[PDB]
């Protein structure tokens, strides 16, 4: 059988895919998430913070 990828496949998106939210996704908290702090977070003070009392 042909082992090469097929360029003649459909490159367009599929609207027939299910638009409804999937309830079978895992609801448990992921322990494999990165526990280290993120250095790439913005170090600059946010001007959009609420300036009122």
């Amino acid at each position, epitope marked *: 059988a042909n082992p090469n990828a097929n360029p003649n496949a459909n490159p367009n998106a599929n609207p027939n895919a299910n638009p409804n939210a999937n309830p079978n996704a895992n609801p448990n908290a992921n322990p494999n998430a990165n526990p280290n702090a993120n250095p790439n977070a913005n170090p600059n003070a946010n001007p959009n913070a609420n*300036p*009122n009392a």
Partner: antibody
Amino acid sequence: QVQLVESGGGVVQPGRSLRLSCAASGFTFRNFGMHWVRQTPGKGLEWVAVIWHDGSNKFYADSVEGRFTISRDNSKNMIYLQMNSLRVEDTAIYYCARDSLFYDHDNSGYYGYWGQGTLVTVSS
Amino acid sequence: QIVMTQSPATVSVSPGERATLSCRASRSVTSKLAWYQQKPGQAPRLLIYGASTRATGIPARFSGSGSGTEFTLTISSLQSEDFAVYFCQQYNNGFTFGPGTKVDFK
């Protein structure tokens, strides 16, 4: 009757310092943060600076970074805009703008109430 | 930051009709966008804030809508006083204004 009356306008040659004053009445001054908004014909409204309710934090636009200084005292209900190193790009009307119509946590940063503003022109 | 554009720049409208003003941002703004009305010689006035909420004293004539990168302002039945310039502002990331659109007599 939230009224914002501005002053300090005039003509200043480039490279000199001008100071604007904004007197506010009709609301609790110390409970809100005030803004300065710049209106240039051919460029529209451009944001300049914002100060906190107690004056703890100050934020400026990129074009005015390091040259403009905003100050506020709560005993006289007035904010100021100390503008050093004026350049000919800065000729415009400067508006005194109040942040928010009322105190909401997730909605702040819109200029609910505006003053008439003053004309500041710089030339030779 | 976020660059705003408005289209069309000017629209010709006869009184009693319905006028539509469009505002588009380069990046997502979620639901933090305001519309201002400025008359010649007058300071801009806040019409709509957040995405659709109307400022106090603003008639139900003015209807705002939109989310994300596409926002729209419509006026149900413009009288003479609804002829002015309108600005689009976002306060989600920085503070940037649109070029401003004008409604003119047709």
